[PDB]
Amino acid sequence: RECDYCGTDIEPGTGTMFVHKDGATTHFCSSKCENNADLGREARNLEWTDTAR
Amino acid sequence: MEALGADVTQGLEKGSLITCADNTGARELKVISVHGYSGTKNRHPKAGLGDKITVSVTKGTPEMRRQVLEAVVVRQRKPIRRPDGTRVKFEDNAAVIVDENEDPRGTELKGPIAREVAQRFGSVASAATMIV
Amino acid sequence: PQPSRPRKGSLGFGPRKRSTSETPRFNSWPSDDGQPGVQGFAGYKAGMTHVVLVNDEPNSPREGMEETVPVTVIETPPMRAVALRAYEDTPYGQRPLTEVWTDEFHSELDRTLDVPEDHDPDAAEEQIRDAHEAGDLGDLRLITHTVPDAVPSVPKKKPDVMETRVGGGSVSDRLDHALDIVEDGGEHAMNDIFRAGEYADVAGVTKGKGTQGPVKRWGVQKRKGKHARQGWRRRIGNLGPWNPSRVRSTVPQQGQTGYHQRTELNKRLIDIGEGDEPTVDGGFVNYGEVDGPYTLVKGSVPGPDKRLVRFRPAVRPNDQPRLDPEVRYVSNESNQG
RNA sequence: CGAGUGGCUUGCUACCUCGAUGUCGGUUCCCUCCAUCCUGCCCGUGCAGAAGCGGGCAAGGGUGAGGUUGUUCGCCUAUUAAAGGAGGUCGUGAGCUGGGUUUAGACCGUCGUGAGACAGGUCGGCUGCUAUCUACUGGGUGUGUAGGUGUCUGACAAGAACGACCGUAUAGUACGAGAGGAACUACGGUUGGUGGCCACUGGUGUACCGGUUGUUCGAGAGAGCACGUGCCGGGUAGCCACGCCACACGGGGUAAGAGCUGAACGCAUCUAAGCUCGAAACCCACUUGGAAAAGAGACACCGCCGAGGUCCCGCGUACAAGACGCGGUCGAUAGACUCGGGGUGUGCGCGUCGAGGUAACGAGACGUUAAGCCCACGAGCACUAACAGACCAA
RNA sequence: GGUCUUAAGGUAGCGUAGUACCUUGCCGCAUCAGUAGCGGCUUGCAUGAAUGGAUUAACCAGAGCUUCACUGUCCCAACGUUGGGCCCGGUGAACUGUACAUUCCAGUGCGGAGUCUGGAGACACCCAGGGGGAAGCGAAGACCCUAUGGA
RNA sequence: GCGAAAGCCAAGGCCUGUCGGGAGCAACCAACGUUAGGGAAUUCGGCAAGUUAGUCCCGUACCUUCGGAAGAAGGGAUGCC
RNA sequence: CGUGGAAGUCUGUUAGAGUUGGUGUCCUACAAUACCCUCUCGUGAUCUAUGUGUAGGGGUGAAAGGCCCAUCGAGUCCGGCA
Numbered sequence A: 001r002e003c004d005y006c007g008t009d010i011e012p013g014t015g016t017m018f019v020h021k022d023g024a025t026t027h028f029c030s031s032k033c034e035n036n037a038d039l040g041r042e043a044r045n046l047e048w049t050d051t052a053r
Numbered sequence B: 001m002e003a004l005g006a007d008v009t010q011g012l013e014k015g016s017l018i019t020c021a022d023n024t025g026a027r028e029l030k031v032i033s034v035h036g037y038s039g040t041k042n043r044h045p046k047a048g049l050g051d052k053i054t055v056s057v058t059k060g061t062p063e064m065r066r067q068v069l070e071a072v073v074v075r076q077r078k079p080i081r082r083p084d085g086t087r088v089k090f091e092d093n094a095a096v097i098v099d100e101n102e103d104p105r106g107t108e109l110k111g112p113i114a115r116e117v118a119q120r121f122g123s124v125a126s127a128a129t130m131i132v
Numbered sequence C: 001p002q003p004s005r006p007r008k009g010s011l012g013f014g015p016r017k018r019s020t021s022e023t024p025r026f027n028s029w030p031s032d033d034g035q036p037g038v039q040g041f042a043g044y045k046a047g048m049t050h051v052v053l054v055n056d057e058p059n060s061p062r063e064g065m066e067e068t069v070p071v072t073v074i075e076t077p078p079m080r081a082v083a084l085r086a087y088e089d090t091p092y093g094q095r096p097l098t099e100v101w102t103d104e105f106h107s108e109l110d111r112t113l114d115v116p117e118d119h120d121p122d123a124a125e126e127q128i129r130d131a132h133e134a135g136d137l138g139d140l141r142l143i144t145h146t147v148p149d150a151v152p153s154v155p156k157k158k159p160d161v162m163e164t165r166v167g168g169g170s171v172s173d174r175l176d177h178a179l180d181i182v183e184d185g186g187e188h189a190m191n192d193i194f195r196a197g198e199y200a201d202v203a204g205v206t207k208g209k210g211t212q213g214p215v216k217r218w219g220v221q222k223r224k225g226k227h228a229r230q231g232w233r234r235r236i237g238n239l240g241p242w243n244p245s246r247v248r249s250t251v252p253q254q255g256q257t258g259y260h261q262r263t264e265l266n267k268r269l270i271d272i273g274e275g276d277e278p279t280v281d282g283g284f285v286n287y288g289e290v291d292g293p294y295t296l297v298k299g300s301v302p303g304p305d306k307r308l309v310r311f312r313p314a315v316r317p318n319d320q321p322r323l324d325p326e327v328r329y330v331s332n333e334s335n336q337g
Numbered sequence D: 001c002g003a004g005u006g007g008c009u010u011g012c013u014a015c016c017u018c019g020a021u022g023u024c025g026g027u028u029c030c031c032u033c034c035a036u037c038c039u040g041c042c043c044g045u046g047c048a049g050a051a052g053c054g055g056g057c058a059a060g061g062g063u064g065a066g067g068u069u070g071u072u073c074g075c076c077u078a079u080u081a082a083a084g085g086a087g088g089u090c091g092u093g094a095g096c097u098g099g100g101u102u103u104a105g106a107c108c109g110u111c112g113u114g115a116g117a118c119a120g121g122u123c124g125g126c127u128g129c130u131a132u133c134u135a136c137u138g139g140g141u142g143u144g145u146a147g148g149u150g151u152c153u154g155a156c157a158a159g160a161a162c163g164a165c166c167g168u169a170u171a172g173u174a175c176g177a178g179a180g181g182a183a184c185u186a187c188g189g190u191u192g193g194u195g196g197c198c199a200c201u202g203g204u205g206u207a208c209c210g211g212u213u214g215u216u217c218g219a220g221a222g223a224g225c226a227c228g229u230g231c232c233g234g235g236u237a238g239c240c241a242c243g244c245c246a247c248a249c250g251g252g253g254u255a256a257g258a259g260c261u262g263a264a265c266g267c268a269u270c271u272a273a274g275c276u277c278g279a280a281a282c283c284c285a286c287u288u289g290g291a292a293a294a295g296a297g298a299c300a301c302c303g304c305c306g307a308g309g310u311c312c313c314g315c316g317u318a319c320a321a322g323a324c325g326c327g328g329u330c331g332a333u334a335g336a337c338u339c340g341g342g343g344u345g346u347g348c349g350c351g352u353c354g355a356g357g358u359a360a361c362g363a364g365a366c367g368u369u370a371a372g373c374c375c376a377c378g379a380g381c382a383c384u385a386a387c388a389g390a391c392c393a394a
Numbered sequence E: 001g002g003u004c005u006u007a008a009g010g011u012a013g014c015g016u017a018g019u020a021c022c023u024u025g026c027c028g029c030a031u032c033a034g035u036a037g038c039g040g041c042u043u044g045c046a047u048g049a050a051u052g053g054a055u056u057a058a059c060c061a062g063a064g065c066u067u068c069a070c071u072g073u074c075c076c077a078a079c080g081u082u083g084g085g086c087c088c089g090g091u092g093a094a095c096u097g098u099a100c101a102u103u104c105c106a107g108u109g110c111g112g113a114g115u116c117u118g119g120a121g122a123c124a125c126c127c128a129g130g131g132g133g134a135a136g137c138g139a140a141g142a143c144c145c146u147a148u149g150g151a
Numbered sequence F: 001g002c003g004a005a006a007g008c009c010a011a012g013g014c015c016u017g018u019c020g021g022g023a024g025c026a027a028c029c030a031a032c033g034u035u036a037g038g039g040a041a042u043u044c045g046g047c048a049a050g051u052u053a054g055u056c057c058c059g060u061a062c063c064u065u066c067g068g069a070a071g072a073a074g075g076g077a078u079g080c081c
Numbered sequence G: 001c002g003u004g005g006a007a008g009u010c011u012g013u014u015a016g017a018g019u020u021g022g023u024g025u026c027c028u029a030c031a032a033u034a035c036c037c038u039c040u041c042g043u044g045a046u047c048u049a050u051g052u053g054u055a056g057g058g059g060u061g062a063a064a065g066g067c068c069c070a071u072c073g074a075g076u077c078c079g080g081c082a
Ligand SMILES: COC(=O)[C@@]12OC[C@]34[C@H]([C@@H](O)[C@@H]1O)[C@@]1(C)CC(=O)C(O)=C(C)[C@@H]1C[C@H]3OC(=O)[C@H](OC(=O)/C=C(\C)C(C)C)[C@@H]24
Pocket: D020, D021, D022, E141
C-alpha cells in the first residue's frame, strides 16, 4: 500500500487507518503525517512529501 | 463470544457519553454496563468495539429518553489492531441500540461500521450502509 | 466490607535478587522419546523485527491468510560440545562421576578455562560403562560452550560455558551418540537440534533495572487523590498489622529489579537460517548488523541485546508442531524512526 | 421443649493501663478462619428436560463498578460464575485522610430565675519526632568448611502461576404432547492474575529541528532573557502500557461419594482385614532460590614458584557505596573522521517576482536547496586513548 | 369537653425548618440508581410575630444542590525537569539510654513478654530502604472519679 | 502597555539570600512539565489542578428597592506590509 | 443627545492593609506563629509614622473573655513565704 498523505510506500505491518465521519478511509504511514493533517496542512504544500516532489 | 479477529483497546468506560448511530429517536447514549464483564478492584468497567453494552438514553426524543436499553459498540476513537498489524481508528465513539435477539431497534444505521462488528452481529451488518 | 483483590505480584519468582550466573541454567529437561540428541542450544540476542506469515493453524478461521507476527532475532552460531559428563544415582540424588574431554579446543577457550593438557578419555569412558553395567548410571549431559568470536556485534570473546542434557533412545545408544559428537570437535548447529516451526523454551537473565520501588517492582498502586499530595506518592500503606509484630517477607518492598533468570515457555521458532535476511537498516539499535547463523523467535525473549539466551525443546507444549511456516516477508526497515 | 459450640452483637465485671497503649468511618498493604456466595467432585428431590430447591466433601482461586449517607450498617442501579461472612489491639494515624464523635466561636429548638445544660440539630475549628534495638526487602565485607578455574548436585525454601467465563461444532439433537431444551468431546476467543519484552500502536523525549510574540546586543546575520523549554509545531534513542509474547496436559494418593470381594452373623452387608474408583483441594509435574546442608557437597582440568587473583587502563549486557560483566595492541573497548541509518522541513547569501510608492522603501513569493542544522544507533577505520607498571598467592 | 391549671389559649404568616423525635415522613422533579438538593403536602416530639414574623433586589474567601465547559481527581499509571537523596573533602549537633539484647511460634504471668516455660530458628560485621514491633520517642491524661483543692 | 502592571534593559549595585567535589545522577521526597482513549467514574466535598481571559463590534434573560441584574449568557474580530 | 464627575461604587499583587484554601513546605524550623501559591480590601467606619492619654478587680474592647511587651476567666516583679 501507499500513504494517502505523503505518498511513500507504507511498510507492511505498520501504519494507521483513519475512518472519517462520512466513511472515507485514509491510510497513514506514520504519526508525523497524521499530525500534519490535523494541523490542516495539505501534503502538496510541504516540500518533504513525495506528493509535492 | 465469537472471536472478532481484531485486538481491541477498550476506549470507553462506565459513564461515557457516546453517539447513537441509528434512527431510533435516541441521539446520545450513556454506558452503564458491559455484557459478560467482571473487573478488578478500583478499575472502571471498560467497553470497546464489538462489545454488547447496557445504555441509558441521555439526549433524544421524550419517549426514548431515560430508557435503559441494550446496545452494540460500533465505532470507537481509540485504535484497534487488525491481523495484518494495521491500526484502525474512528472519528467518534458510536453504538447501535439492539433488542433481546440482537436485532437493531431502528431501521437505518447512520455512519460507518467496522467489519469485525458486522461479522459478530449479523442483523446489524445487513442494515449497515458502510463497512470499513 | 472492603473489596477483595489479588495480591500485588507473584511469590513464585522469589527472592527477587541478582542472578549468580549471567548464563541461564535450566532446571528441567525434556522427556526421552525419539532418536538421541542434545536437549538444547544457545545464542545471543540481536533485536526485533516483524515477519508476515501464512496461518498454519488448522482450527483458525484465518487458515491460509497473511498475518503479521512480531519476532526476536537471535544470532545462533555453532557451539562446541567439549565434554561428556556422566551422573550416577546415589542415595543423595545425582552426583557427577567422570568427564570425557577432547584434544581439539577453540583458540580462545583459555579465557574462561584451565584447558586440559593431560587427560585419559578412555579411562573415563570405561568408568561410565562399568557404572552402566552396574545399573548406577543416571543421566548423560554435555559440557558445551559458545563461540562469541563468531558474532561481531558481541564484544566478548570469552566463551559462555553451560551443561546440556542428551536424551532419546536407550542409555547405551545415547552414550555412544554423545561420545561421537565430542570425539570429533564438538561442533553442532541449531539445525542438529531444532527444526523451524517447533516450540522451544527460552531461558534468559532479564534486563537490569537496578533498585526500584514497590510500584514498579510489585505493581502496587500509587497513592491516590489527596493522599498523593501529603508527602507519600509511591510508598505502600503499611508494612503489616499490629500483630504479628514483624514484617512478613510477603509485603511488597523496594529492592533489586531485573537481572533475574526467567524461563519463557512455548516460544515458536519462526525460521532458522543464515545470512543477512533479518537485518535492520542502519543496524539493530545498540547491537549491530547480522550476517550469519540466526533464529527467529516468535515474540519477546528475556534479556537485552548482546545477552546469551538458551534454547530447549518445550517440556510442556499446548499445541502440536506445525513445521516450516511460510515466510512471505521479513521487515528490514530501520528501527530508528 | 431439651443439649451445646463460638467469641462476630449487646450486656455484665472492674483484673491490666490514668508520670497518656492516639478516636469512628474510610483508605492502602500483608497473613489467616470456615459456619462455602461462585468455581470442582458429589447425595436427595415434590429429580422428564431446561432452570431449580435441600444436603455432603472442599478454603486453590475469585467474590468486582456505581447513586443517597461521615457513616459501620443499610437502601437502590446496572453488570456478574458469584458479586459469602469473619479474625489479625472492633489488623493497619513513628502510613494516609479528618467527613462523624469530643475543646475554645456562633445559631435554633427544649429546659433553667440565672450562670448555663442537652446521649437534640447546625456552620467553623491544629494531625509532632533526624530509627538506638528488633523485623523484613534488597546490597556488600569477613570468618568457617581447607591453592585455583569452570561445570554441577539438591537438603530444604517460594508460587495461584494459574483462576473463571462466553461462543461454535455436538444440536434444534437426547428428554418432553408441546412449550422448552441439555451433556461427553473438540475447537475459537474474553476476563482477572502472573512473568517478560518494545518489531508494531501509543506516551514521554526542558537531545534535536522549525515557527513565532516582547525586549536587549544599531539594522542584517547570529544570539541572551521571559523558572529552571517564553509560547506553539514535529520528534530519534531510551524508558514505558494504552502496545506485544508466554503461563498445560498428565501422573500418584485421598475426602464426600459410587462400587467389588468379604466375615463376624450359613443369609445379607462398600469395611471389620483386602480392593477398584473418585474433588478447582493434597503430592509429583513446571517456574524461582538454594554449599553456611557443621554429614559445611560432587566432577573435570590447571597449579604449589607459580595456576589463578588484585591494583591499574578503555568501557557497559551492570550499578545508590560495594558488587557484577566485557575489552586491554595476538586489540574494534571508548573518542575523532567518513559513510549508513534516523530527526526537522528547505539555510546564509545572491537572482527574479512583489501590493504599492516619484524615488527612498517594501510584508511576502520563487529558485538556487530532498536544502541547512542535528543525533544518546550502526559500519568502516588503530589516527587518538586501552600505556607504563605494581601487589598478593599454596 | 360541647370549662381546668396559672392571666391568656397561638391570630398574619412560616412550616419535616441550621427548629421535626418518629425519619431516608408521603407525592413530585432529577439520576441507571439521589439518607443529598428543590417544589408541594405538613396534625408543628418542641414554628410564630422588635425573645420580632414574613419577604426580598443587591452584596459574600459564609452552608447545601444541579447543569455546561475543563482537566491525571480517578480508570492507571509513564516519561521528563530542577533541588535533595547516594559517593568524596571540610564543618558538625540533638532526641534518647536500668541492665542484658540474633529472634520466631505457642504457652505462662497483674488477664497485651526480645529477657519466664517448651520448642523452632540463629556464623560475625557493614550499606541502602520503607517504618511491623519495642503496648517506640515527646507531655506527672485535658476525658472520668476522688480531695472537708483553686479560680 | 491603560498603568507606579508583566516581561526585557540602562544608571548604580552585586556574584555574601556565602561550603564544596563526584555519579545520565537508582529507590524515595520537594517543586514542576507533558501524557493516548475515557472525562469527576475520584472524594465528605472537583480538595488539588485545570478551563476562561486583554481590546473592539454585535447582542443580552428572570427578577428589581428602577440604582441594579450586566463583562448576564451567546456570536464575530484581532498579525505584518 | 451632550456636559458633569457623584460613590462606606466596581477591576486592580500601584503603594499599602488583610489572611480564604492548599488542612502544601516547615514542624530538634530560616522562624517560640516562618515559606510558597491561591484568596480579600484598596477615597474610606481607609492605611500609616512619631508624639501623647487610659493601669491591674483596674484600662481598653464594632464583644472573641479579645488585648494590656512570647505573660490574661484578672499583667509583671519582689515580698507575705519555708
Ligand atoms: C497518646 O495517647 C494515649 O496513649 C492514650 O492511649 C489510647 C487512648 C486512651 C489512653 O489509653 C491513652 O491515654 C484510651 C485507650 C483509654 C480509654 O480508657 C478510653 O476509654 C479511650 C476512649 C482511649 C482511646 C485513646 O483516647 C485518647 O484520648 C488517648 O489519647 C490521649 O489521651 C491523648 C493524646 C494522643 C495526646 C493529646 C496526649 C489515648
